[PDB]
Structure formats: structure tokens, C-alpha cells
Design a protein around this nucleic acid. Sequence first.
RNA 1: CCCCC
DNA 2: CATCCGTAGGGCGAG
DNA 3: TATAATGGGAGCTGCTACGGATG
Lengths: 158, 94, 1111, 110, 14, 104, 263, 83, 39
Amino acid sequence: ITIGIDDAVIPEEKKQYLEEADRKLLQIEQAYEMGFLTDRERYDQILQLWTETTEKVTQAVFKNFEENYPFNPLYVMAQSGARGNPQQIRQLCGLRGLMQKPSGETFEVPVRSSFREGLTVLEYFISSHGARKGGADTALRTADSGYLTRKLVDVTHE
Amino acid sequence: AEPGIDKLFGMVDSKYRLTVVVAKRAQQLLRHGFKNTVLEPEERPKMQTLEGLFDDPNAVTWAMKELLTGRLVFGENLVPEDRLQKEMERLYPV
Amino acid sequence: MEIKRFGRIREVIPLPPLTEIQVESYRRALQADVPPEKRENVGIQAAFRETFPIEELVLDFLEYRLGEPPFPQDECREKDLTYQAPLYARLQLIHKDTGLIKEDEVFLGHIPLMTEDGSFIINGADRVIVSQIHRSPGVYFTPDPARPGRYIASIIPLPKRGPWIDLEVEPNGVVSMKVNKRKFPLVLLLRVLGYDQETLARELGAYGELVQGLMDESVFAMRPEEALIRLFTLLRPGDPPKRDKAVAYVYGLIADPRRYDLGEAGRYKAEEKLGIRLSGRTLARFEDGEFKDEVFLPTLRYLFALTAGVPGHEVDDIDHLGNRRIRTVGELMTDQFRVGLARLARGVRERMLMGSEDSLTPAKLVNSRPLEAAIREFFSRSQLSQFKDETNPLSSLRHKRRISALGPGGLTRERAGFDVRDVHRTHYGRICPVETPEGANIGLITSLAAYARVDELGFIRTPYRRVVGGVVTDEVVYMTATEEDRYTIAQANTPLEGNRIAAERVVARRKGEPVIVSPEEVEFMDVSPKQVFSVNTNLIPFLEHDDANRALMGSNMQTQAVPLIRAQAPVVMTGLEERVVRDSLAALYAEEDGEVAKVDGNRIVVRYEDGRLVEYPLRRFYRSNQGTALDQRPRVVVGQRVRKGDLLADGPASENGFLALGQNVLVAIMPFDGYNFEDAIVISEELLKRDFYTSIHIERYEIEARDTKLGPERITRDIPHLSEAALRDLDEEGVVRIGAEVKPGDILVGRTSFKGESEPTPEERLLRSIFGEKARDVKDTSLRVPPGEGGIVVRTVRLRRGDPGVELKPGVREVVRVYVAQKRKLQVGDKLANRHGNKGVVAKILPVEDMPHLPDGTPVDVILNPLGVPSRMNLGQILETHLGLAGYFLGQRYISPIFDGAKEPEIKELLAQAFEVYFGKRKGEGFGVDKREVEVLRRAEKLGLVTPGKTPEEQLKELFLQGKVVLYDGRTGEPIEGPIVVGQMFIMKLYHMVEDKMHARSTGPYSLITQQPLGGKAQFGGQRFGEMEVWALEAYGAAHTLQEMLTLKSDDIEGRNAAYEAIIKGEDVPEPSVPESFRVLVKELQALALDVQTLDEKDNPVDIFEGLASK
Amino acid sequence: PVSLETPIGDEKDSFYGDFIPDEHLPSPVDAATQSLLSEELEKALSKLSEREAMVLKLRKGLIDGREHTLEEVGAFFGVTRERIRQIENKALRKLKYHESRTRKLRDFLD
Amino acid sequence: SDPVRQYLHEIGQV
Amino acid sequence: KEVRKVRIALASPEKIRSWSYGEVEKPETINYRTLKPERDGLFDERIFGPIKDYECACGKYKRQRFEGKVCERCGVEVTKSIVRRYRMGHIELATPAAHIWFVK
Amino acid sequence: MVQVDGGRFATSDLNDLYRRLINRNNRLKKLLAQGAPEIIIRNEKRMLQEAVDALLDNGRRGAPVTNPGSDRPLRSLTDILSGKQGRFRQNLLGKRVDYSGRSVIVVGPQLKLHQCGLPKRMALELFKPFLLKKMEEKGIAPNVKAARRMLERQRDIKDEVWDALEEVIHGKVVLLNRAPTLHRLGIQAFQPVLVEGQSIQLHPLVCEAFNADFDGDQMAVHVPLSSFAQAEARIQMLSAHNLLSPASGEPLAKPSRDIILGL
Amino acid sequence: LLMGVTKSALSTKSWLSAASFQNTTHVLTEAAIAGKKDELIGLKENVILGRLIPAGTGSDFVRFTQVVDQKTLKAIEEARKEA
Amino acid sequence: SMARPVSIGEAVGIVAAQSIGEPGTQLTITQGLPRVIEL
RNA sequence: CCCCC
DNA sequence: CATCCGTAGGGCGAG
DNA sequence: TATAATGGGAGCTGCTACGGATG
Ligand SMILES: [Mg+2]
Ligand SMILES: [Zn+2]
């Protein structure tokens, strides 16, 4: 068991799903500029399209692994439960996906790259928002968890 | 895992009672210098030195093995404390 | 060797002076090299000029001057001195009644000087002043959270330079102003400013319903004087409203430039937001006897226009980097200087009353102690003044570029939510989104971007290239975030043919929003990807392939790398490793062209073109703040011709001018018998054999001999009751000899202390009688080597009383310092890490014969577990390993720049060129394919790695292009059943070492009040058994272990003494007693007038003090 | 003087007085050493006669805490002061001989 | 709540 | 006897005076030259006990043969120094003062 | 009021609060005896009340009294009692303890589930009195004092004391703990195996209950002293005897990572 | 009545437990007024007192259990028969 | 932990508190640990 | 405080 | 509805 | 020990929240 850069296998389905998502996004923009749907509805439709495309490329990664490389290291470690989960393998081999602003509102453009392909400085900076927000979440959550644990100990100790 | 820990947990209604029995028996063995043991010379726990096999100095291992034998009696209100201590000191002096 | 660099991006400008944020800030603050008449009213000048003239006799300020340092930097570090310059001020005392003038230059103390690298020497220790980010002063407009359709106007000055003023439109309709937690109608303050109903009606009437809420008849009826007295009664209740008192208070609150100071940045922000011009940095003026408004009416007008929805008016993003600014070394030091100066001015004003009102000089009027105290306080005890992190040169280089939101005048940790810690879109090119502490300080401590510089106003600016038409110029403009939001800025990797944009569609940013744009719409372009990240983050090759959470750890851990004696630069570099060593003045370079006259281990003598002979002494085996050895090694030979800027000597952790934070080792990515389980690491004994990851560390020991009321402490070789074996390595005076090996328990400096008076116990009387030997007057107080420490004595420093040039603190006769060094080999428990966030502790050092090895007999150095890669998503280490294999067999190193580096096809080509050397050499040596290689190829084509039917050489090359090779298990000789990734990886040895952290304690020192063991390895303390550990012991039901923790093993005095005696006597430990801290609790409750009584089952009192506290 | 509650670090978590040991109360090691000294002293005094060990105990203060003069010990055993001085000297001689033989009380000389 | 202000007010009554 | 309960209650001035081994009449701590405690101060040995075990201040009685004795010259009881962690003092206020716990 | 190492003096803030109180009280007595007017007496009485408040609970009412040249509030009795640093939570519900140590942990795959690798020097310090008794039983030292004087210098340490230490720790167990101790399995009992080197060796299967890994984690070691504590540790707290989670009832010590991968 | 864990813990009969939890001044004032007596029922009380907690080996259920070997047991039995 | 009847004397409340608190740092479309504390 | 888990 | 007080994870090494 | 002198002086804790009591 080892890990080379080729062990993160990009499925051939990724380009197909991405071109389909691009034609769908063009259709949504055309249906917007003609005034059939709001900015709100268009933004929601873009987010939903990209969510479903992300799920599709995840399933494509794992189906390609199951059928053509069942002893691939990433696939073996994920299936056995030794290491990794489907979303991390998706970020490795598929696309990084949608990222959120500091406000929690999601960007319209997703990160089309994967860690095997490498991101762009813009995509990296876009992901840094969510990374930092998760870090702050954990830092401020540990104290609340410990406080709650102490409350429970004090109330149940006898 | 301690040898026969499952059977030792089987002997008691509470694991902590097993702990109490083992600790008090080890205290007895330490106080009377192991000469109050229920074990036979071939049942004595052994320890490997550079010289060779010697008696195991750990009284807790001794007590757990003795308990596994079944020759020990444990319970509540078996004998007044002073009477027990004095009969033990009469049978196995300091 | 050959150095191959990838990438097609051409950076028009180099990296700025990386420590300029400190150097230029302090240089502008001091203005020492500017002749006094030509200075600028900034920094120390501005402080003097704000404090004076002192009115009351009138004392006025003419100029100041800074002298030369009394001692150099090395001498300051040696003698625990502050590297500083004397400050003098020429003041003329004037008697406005007499016209008399007495002028003198008074000495105001010393001011610390910044060294060449941007650090300070305070009391002998190197320190860094970290820049502080905060809200820029000015006028902001935020949404009112309670009422959606309303807003709050916030007038914010500089910290400690006045209150924050809040303008609000209350639900009742009247406009309120909030100052010092008190609210009042703004109309009253407007009336004090001289506004009448006509002016307000004609000015604000365009916004319908709010001006009537502004109207109050009783306020307009009374003239500004009655309004002023009324406002004073509102702000200062109970104070008799004397008119002069009201004038003075309102002036000091709003119009006083000494008590209220908007920033120069604050003034600029106000002028830009409100579209006005400020005559000064106050909200109003006192002119011609009355008050004249400056700021209030424009802010109120903007607030009303924003509430009415008037176009062109926006709310302010307070986390936008145009509204957040940096206060650097100069600004903070100048603030504390200004505080000390104001205190000195208070002293002056008090002196201008007492004494003789006639005979006074400037020297009699000025007491400089407050100013010296303020500056010393700032440099010694401030939070932004930190112990310099000089573990390696990059440590201090990064430390000086740090940005803190904490510190005085800033955030507390509870005051920091998600908004402040977040990465703002304006952090682009200014603040690194990667390098930030992991844990509680996340988002609060950050690092300056590589290409970023702080302007004179305090705002971080980033460079961009101008794009006219479709042509990208070479002219660069440094923009703030506010100015950056105006343009459409293309990405740095957009294709170019010449200076023309070669793409039909480009990737650009508009207010941080990504967009696809035509080349005609491109107004600017990024300089480089490097500008987005910090210096530490820019040293991580293949950064685009690493998840941000692990690149953060890589950046932060490069700081912790220890300088190695055989340190080397990575085989895969990013192109910044030379410039980092350059700007971090650890390495030595040649001033001009010339010839090397002399090369020594201690010095290098160079003869330049000018003919002048310059001698550079080399720092050899100097101890840094963290114990790592800073030492310079010469890299030139006698008679060598050098040019301007050529390397003369390598500093610590540098190799031929390149940054050398670790070593390049042959690594194999595979599990190994669970010894690399959960990020642990397996290494080869060959690393210790050839002294890889070996580091020199020096520890400093100190001891004082002082005068006592019982007699002098003496540093002597005569120590009572000690054998010659114990005193062997001590000289005549009692100091250990240089070069001696000292181990735990050995004496470093002998010392005797006169015994405290005491009556010998009767047992001691009988002992003395039996042996017939008098008890000595003195006791052994010698300094000894602590447990776990020791090494070779390399230096001794002794300072006595009454010898030339030295004076100790009162009562101290002499001070001795002993420097002990040690060569630390890598061992089990030391911590290693790469630049991609992969970190692990060494768990096993195998002999070379057990190591997995290549077919040609070459064993690997490090075995990394592949399970650490998938969850972490840091693939940069994998590409580094592949390119390192290629460079291992081609014998060359690489520069793969960030986001523009070597891609997969080029690495495949280099790997083919390397496979040729790796295999055709064997084939020419008269050897074919191995049997086990054939079996591995069978199992590999079963894995789909190689194409079936090709020759064994072709399949082995197919595997080598995938970075995988056949690996033999040194234990069996049989191969690993699959091809394994093997290559060269750059790994560092971090500062966390088991030798420093191993500690144990049986018994030892106890605390004064609690009688519980002390804390820390340095105090030989015990481990804290906190609340959660007690919870664990409780849930286990282990009552006696918990009671031992609470009694025998701590603060049960009788219990612990009896326990120690029983254990050393072989008896079982006794029954525990009352913990002494409970008696402390009882007595501290009694001091609170509460009677705490321990009772028995009969409710009778039980005395846990045993009759000692009851009469 | 300086406050024991002087903070260490800019965290509120530690005080200066927490780094200051207690030099007054004997450590467990020192108390154990003094107890072993008393016990070895009694072991060595048992090798004398009761009377010549009692003379030394009374003269060096192990009994009652005071060091009796030769006249007082002599009057207590009824004997002459020269008599008691002589038995004291011979008891000390026996003690020194037993010490040179067994080397027991040497380690307590520090 | 301020002892000095209270004492000054008391002083001002004589 | 074995402790089975712990009671907490308000303390009368009489009980506070019954705790106290003496009144601290002076703000003094220790003498600036001798470093010994100042009489009637916060560290007075006559109130809180001896600094050294079974030894009075002036050094007239220096061993356990006197225990419970109070030296006539210096006024210090000869006992274990440990009592300085236990024995309480008191200050007699000229005007009653409210315990802020029962106020705020 | 204690003299530190360098002869300087360090004292508690309670002394300064008491001094304030006593000064104001004596001044009130003197003002009363000298027949001061009611304004002066009233000011003095209010100051006395403020001083008593400062002594009992400083900062409770009004501005907190500070030492001169410092913004630090003086530590009153209430501050001593309550808080995370207060007497209860810092010195009563938890303590620093004797016979304890701490070191960096290393994976010990060769260990049995009931075992842990313990460095030699850590064990020599932790079991030091037992080791003195054993060095007296064997002829290594004349008595305990000589054995301790011999252990004090590291170069005086011979190889028989290591065999004696092996004899001492026979059958006994130690307690390993890793912070944060979230559940009772944050502490576990292990039989120690003496090892060269300065690292503690931890069994892999227990790494999940401790949430321990080997990127630099450290653990603390404790020595249960009595026969009762040793029995509690060997029976109730032993790692091999706690295989299921007390929360879910599922297995806690179970295969993971490399083990799962190989199987 | 339903009260959260904090209020319920503060409202417990033991004043040592409640005073070591939170709101030390309030708990202590009310307990000192009431003359409250802590019966040392729970764990925190005995932990503060340095006592043997009423759980595990400290539970009164298992605390007094005796051990005796058959030789000594029967010697005691014959000694008690002859009285 | 033993898949058998609990022993008399087991400190059950402490085990309950620890069992509920230990996964607290793992609680994250979801209300999470704020909801747990609210309850 | 800064760092580590 | 306001206002005051009160909590707000643990252990750890240096300086 | 005697000229006359007659109401302080900082300028925050400054970017949190949430709830249990008392007004
Ligand atoms: Mg870890
Ligand atoms: Zn006396």
C-alpha cells in the first residue's frame, strides 16, 4: 500500500458533467436575462445544479474505483474504514466543490479543480474563508463543550 | 488481562467487592509475611531473577491466585475484627 | 550541481525588503538621521510638539537630538544592557511677563534602538515589537441591529485619544448623541456650535421627516452660552456649572488637539467619506472665543441621507482592509513616548508653582523619570513586545512580519467572534490566508503578505501591474483595498505573448468577486501568485496541491525547524530560499567587488576595489533565545575574487546562501510493522551514522553570590564535606573548567552560604559528640546540573564587585554564568515534519540491514505511512517525492514556483531521464532483471499499473514514471508484493525534543500557601491532577487511588511524610489525613466572617486543627 | 517588597508565588533522614551498658532535651564527677570502636 | 458612589 | 472521632473574639533592620505563634521541655511553628461595618 | 511575607488590605478621641466601610483598590475562594501530585494490551523510595541514606540498581493519562516495561480511547502506592479489562488504521 | 418543576458541592444564614474533604467485606466454640 | 463496558456526564451543541 | 502571553 | 422592559 | 511651629452574550 499522485484517479465522467453543468448554467443565465426568474431563484438554481453535479462526480469517482481499480489505495483505505471518507476522496479526485463566503452565503462559482490537479490562487483564497470559519468554530466550541461537561458532572455526581 | 479475571468477576455480585477482597487479602499476606497463604509450594507465584526463580513479592497477584483456588472465604460480618486480628497473630505471629 | 527552475510567469518587481515594516517604521519614528530643523512633525517630533509649550512661566520646546549608543549590540547582550541612544531636548524657559529667557539642553534618558534586522535588545534579551491591526479611525455608518430601517453613525478617534461618539435617530424622532455612556439630544451640542434653526432647516431639509425630529424650540431659544452650560450640566451632574469650567470641559472633550486626536488616517477617512476638508484632527475648534463645528454636521447629513436612501451613500464594512489599519513599531513606541511626555508635562506644571518663581532653569523644571518609565514599561512589559523567536533565521523574519489583533487598545479573546477571525476578501495580497495559529488565536494572529507593505497611513497595500488596452505594462501601483475595489484586476497566470494578453477570456476580480472578462476590460493584473501568501507559505512547493489546513501547519512548522550541523537546502525549492537568507541578516555578503585577503574560522578579511581592507568577524557558537546555536561558517577561500553581493559566510540553517531548515532524505511511502502507526515515523540508523539531523544546543546557567545579614555568600572551591571526585573539574576559584563534561548532579559553580542560626537537635549533639567534628559555619549552596541536562562547558563569565566596569544590583557581590553546549543526535521521541504539514515523532530507529532497500543495495532513510495522506489531502509531498527521486538519480535540484511550477508531464520526463541512469547502468554492468522484480511486475500488472505484454524493462520504466520502484525487505530479502513510492523528501527536525520534555518527580518542592507541589520541569514540579482526571478516577470507582491523589501524594503533610517513611521502610502506606488546603479554605472562610465547622454524627464539633487554633 | 500575586504571562493563569518553594518545613527526605539517624543512634547506644549509654544520653541532651553537667550525671548515678567523666569517656571509646568496625553512622555526617 | 465627590459635597455645605 | 458532617454558619463578634489569640493594633509587618516581626503587627509572634518550633522570640526557652509556656520577656508561647497557619487574630473596629456579602 | 532566592521579599495582597483597614481604624479612633467634627468622622467611617469591603470582596462595590503604580486589583478573600483559579477548583477538587511524571509518547506495536513502555530514568524517579528499600535489601547500599546519595549523581549509578528497579516494579501497574480527560478512559492502567530512551510507549489499540496520536502528544504517568490502589488499578482500571465503551456499549479497543488495512 | 442542569446543581442540598460549582458567594451566604449542614452524601464533598468517596471500593455495600483463610477461619471457629 | 449487570457502587452519574460530554466537540441544516445545551 | 496536544 | 452579575475546556514547556 | 494660601481629577473595563433574579 502506497500513494503516488496517479493513485488519485480523475474519472473521465468529470469533463462530461462539467460541460453539462456549463450548458445548464448558460441556460439559466439566458432564462434570467429574459426576466423569467429572479436573482434569488437563479442563485438557488445555480447552487442546486452544482450540488447535484458534485454528487454525480463523487459517484463517478467511486464507481470508476469499484469497477476498474478495486485495489486502488485510496479506495481500499476508504472502503475498509482504515482512513478517508467519500468527500475527501471527492476533493482529491473529483472537484473541490462549492465554497462559502465569510457571511455563510455560497459563491456562485465552484472550485472546479481537485487537489491532484491543483487549485488556482483565487480558488485557494476562496476556500480559506471556510477553512478559517471551521477553525474558529472548533476553537469556540471546545469551551462550550467543556462547560457543559462540568455542569453535567456537578448535577449528576451524587 | 489478569489471569482468570472473568472467573474472579463471576465470584462476586460487584467488581468493587472483588477489589476489596483482593486488597485486604494482600494486606493480610504482607502483614503476616505470606506464611498465612492458602497456596501450596507448587502453586506459589514465581518471579524470574538473574539468580533464578524466587517467590513473587507482589501480594496482589498472590491474593488473586488464592481467590481463584477457592480456599478463601469472603463476606460481611464473618467475625469480629479484634478477634480475627488476634487469632491471626496467634497462628502467624509478627 | 544543476538547478532547474520551472514556470513561465515573469515577475516585474522583486520582493520588497522583508523587514521594512519594522525598519522604515522605526526610522520614521526616530528621525535620527534628519537634521533637527529639517524634521517632520511625526513620531518623537510630533510627541514633543504636542506636549509643548507648557503654559501653566512658559516652557517651550526647540529641538531634540539622539546620541550614539554607549555600548554596542554584542556588549549589550553580554552585560544585560538595553541597546539604546541618549535623548536630549533643547528647552527655553520664558517669562512672558519679564521677557527673561533661560535656555538649556536637558537629558531625558535613553531610547532603545532598533538593530539592522528590525529587532531590539532589552535588558540583554532580543525582542520584537509585533505590529497591531485595529479599526482605522474616522466616521463609519453601520446598520442598527434593533431597528432595520435605521442606522448608527460612529465617530472613532485613535485609541486613548478620545471617546467614541455615536449618532442615532431614536424611535421618538429626535437625534441622540452618545458620549461616555451618556446620551443627550444632538441639537443641544449643535446649538453650542452656533447653529440656528434657519441653517439646519436649509441644510438638512432635503431629507423630509428627520429635520422636524431635529427641531427643539427651547434649545434654539437659548443662546450658545446657555446651551453650553446646559450641556455641561447634562454631562457632569453635581459639578457647579461655572461657565469657564464648561468651556474647558467641552473643549477638552471635542476641540482639544491634546486630548482628542483623530488619526491622520482618521482625518483622511473622514474627509473621503463625508466629502469635506478638516482643518485639524479634532471634531470642532475653539476660535475667536466660541465653538466652530467641523465634523458633526457632515456626519449628521450623511446619516440622514443614508436613512432616506439617498444614492451615493453606503454602509461601511468594518472588516474591510480599507477600514482596518496597522500600527507598527514606531506608532506604538510613539504613543507610549507621548504618554510619558504628558506625565513629564504635569510634573513641569506642578514645579512652575512651588519653589522660587524667579530662579528656575529648564533643568530644575523637568523630571524625566515618567518618560523613562513609560518607555521602559512599553519595551519590557507590553504584550506586543515579545521574546524574539530566533530558533532559525526564518523564525525571526516571520516574527517581525506578524500582525496581532490582541494587545492593549485591541481585542480580548472573548471580544473576538467569527467576523474578526474570518479571512476577508480584501486580505488578498495583504494578509496571508494560510499562516495563522492553530487553536484559540486563529484569525487573531496573522502574517503580512510577501509583496505587501504598510503605507504611511497604516493601510496595507499590494502591487498590481497597469494594463492599457490589451498590453500589460511593467509599471506597478501599490493599492489599498479601497482603491483596489475600483478596478477589474486580472490573474497573474493569464496567457501572454509579449506584453499583450493572449487569451480571448481572462479570469479577473471585481471587488473580490471572480469574473470572466474580455481583455479590453482589464485595468490591472496581479504581479505574482507569491503576493497572495506569506513568506512561510511561499516556501511550500506544490502548494496548489495541498489542502489549506495542512499548508497552515507546514508554514507554522518551518518556524520551529532547528539549525542542523549538516543542514542542506531542499532538492525542490520555490525560489525564495536565497532571498530569505539574504533579508534575514544571518548570512554574510561582500560589500563591493574585491579579493579575499584572509579566511579563518573566526574572521574573513576582504580587500575591495577601493583598496580598503575590511575585516568581518564571524559569530561562532552563539546561543539564541531558544537555545539553538547561531554560528557563521566561511564559504570563501584565500585569494578568491568576489563581486558585490557575493556570499562570504553561511549563517545558521543556510547552505551556500539557500535556506536550509532540514535535510533531504530518501523516503519510502509504506507501512512498516505498525512502527509508523498514526503519523509516527521510522528512520534509519544511517542518519545518525552520517550525523544527519544532529544539532548543537547551548544552555545558560547563572548564580549570584550576595551579601547576607548572616555573612557573605562566597563562590569558592572549598565546599564542606565534598570529595575530590566532586571537585575535580573546578578551578581554584570554584568555577567549572572550560571543556569539562558535566552530567546531572555535577557542580557548575561552587558556592557557600552562611548557615542560618539554629539549635542542633539533641540527636545532632550526640552525633557531634560521637564523631568529635565541629559543624561547619557554611552550607553547600552550589549550582548543579539539573536532571536530564548537561554537556560540555564552552564558556564561563564571572563578574565581581569592585572590578573595573561592572556594577551589580544592590547586595550582590558577584555573578557567574556558565555556558554548556551539547550535540544532540536524532532519537526516539524527537519530532520531524515536512513543508506540507506532514508531522510525526520518531518511533523506531532500525539498523541499516532491516531497512527496505532498492535492488542496487541502496537502503531508504525514512519510512512514512501512507495512511497520513488521504485524510489530510496534502499531495504536494507526493509530487515533491517524485521530483526528488528524479533529482536523486539525475543529481540535480529544482525550483518549482508557487502555483506556477513543474507539472506532471515534466516530472514524467525527468523520471524517464532518471530511469535511464537507474537501469541502463545495471544493464551495462552485466545484470538482467531479477526474479523478484518479475514477481513484483506480475502483481503490478494485476494491479493495472503496467501494460501486459511489454518487456520487464518497459514495465519497470512504466512504474518508475509513476514514481514507484521495486523495494526489497531487508529482513527477508523477499520483495514487497507491490511497487512502492520512493524518492527524496525535505524533512526538518523541529524544536520539540524528548530531551527537553521528559520529566518525573517522586517528591520535591511544595507551594507556600497550598502546600501542594510546584509546577514545571524547571521547578521539579509534579503533574496537575485536575478536575477531569478526578472525574476519570471517580467513574472508575477507584476511591483509594483518588484519595492518594488528594492526600498522600500532595498537601497532606503528615500523610506524605509518613508515606515516604513507610515506603523507604518497606511498610504499607498509612491512612491519609486532612488535606492542608482544606484547612486553608476553612481559615480563609473564617477571615470572611463565616464559621465553617466539621461535625461528627452527633453534630458535635470536630477539630481538624488539633487544638492548635483554639485558646 | 513585591506582590506574591504578581502575574506571570499575560494569561491570568499563574502567579509569581507559585514558583517560590517552601524552605522552612522539612522535606520528606529530611524527616526520614533524621528518623533514621535517631534509630541508628539508639542501635549504637544499645551496644553499651545501660549506665554508660544513659550517661551519654543525659550529657548530650537526647533525654529531657538538656545537656547535664558532669556533676549532675555523677550525682544522678550517685558517683563522683571524675567517676562519671571516666565512664563517659570509656563509653565514647566503645562507640568510636563500634563505629570504626561497622561504619554505620558515617553516612549521616553529610 | 464616589467617596471623594461625596466628601467634597459635604465640605461645600459649611 | 470521625467527621460525618460539615456545618457553616454566621459568626458572632463573640465567636470571632474567641478565635482570636490577640488584637492586631498596628499596620507594621516586620522590622526593616532585624527582619523579625513587629510587635502588635500583622506577623506578631505573641499573637499567631512562634516562627521556629518550640522556641520563643528572644530565645530564653528553646526546647520542648517547655511547651505551653509563655516567655515572660518576649511573650511568645513555645509550641510548633505550624500554629502560624492556624491561629487567628482580630481587629476591633471603632464603628461597626457591614459584611458586603450580606449587602451586595 | 517570605524572602525569595535573591533575598527579595514577596508578600500577599491581604497584608496591604489589612494595613489599609488598620490605618483607617486607628485614624478613626484618634479623630474620635480628639473631638473631630461630624464631616471628618463621617468621611473616616465611610472609608473604613470601603476598606472592609475591599478586604472581604474587592471590586464588589466601587472601583477595585490597586497597589500604587499598578492597575492590578488586589486579591481579596472572595477572589481567593471563587473562580477557576480559586481555592475550590484549583486546590480542593484537583491537585498537583507526587509520584508523577510526563513525557512524549511513541507507538509500541510489540506491547501487549496490558503493557506500556516506560523509560528507565522516569521509573527510577517514580519508584525511588521502593528502589531505595530494594537497594538496601540487596547489598547495593549500606542503608537508605547511602542509596539516595548514590542515586543523586548520575555517574555513580551502576547496573545492579537497574536490576533492582526491575525487581521493584514487578507485577505493579502505572496510570497513563492524556489531557483533555473527556471520559474515564482518559486514564488507564498498564503494566510497565522498562525501556531505554526517554519516550513513553503506548499500545495502538488504546489510542482511540485516549484520542492520542504521535504527532507530538505527551502523557502523564502516576504510581498508585497502596496495595488498595494497586488492586483498584489492576482490576478496575486495567486497559485489557475495559474493552467496551461505557457510553454506547460498543467495542472501544478495536482494530483501526494499519490493522484494518492489512486484514 | 423543571429546572436546567445549572440551577439544579446550584439548588442541591450539599452546600460544599454547590459552593464549589458556581456562585460561591450567593451559595455561601444562604448556607451560612441557614446554618446548613453538609452530610457528605455526594462525591465532591468527600473529594474536598480528602475523604474516601462513597463509590466503588468506598461504597458501604462492599467496604466492610472480610477475607480469611480456612486454617485461620477454623481456628477462630474452635476458639469461639470453646467459650 | 462489561455487557453484564452493573455492580453496586458504580459511580453512575459521573459516567453519564462523561458519556454525554465526550462527543461534545464533534457536534456540528443542524442545530448541534447549541441545541444540546438549550435542552 | 507565545507555543504544543 | 431594563440593569447588575455571573459564567464561559483541559494539561503542557520555556521567558 | 505664624505673609497668605480654602471643593480631585481621570478620561476606561470601549467590537460578546445570555439569563436569573430584582426593580
Ligand atoms: Mg495529536
Ligand atoms: Zn522569650
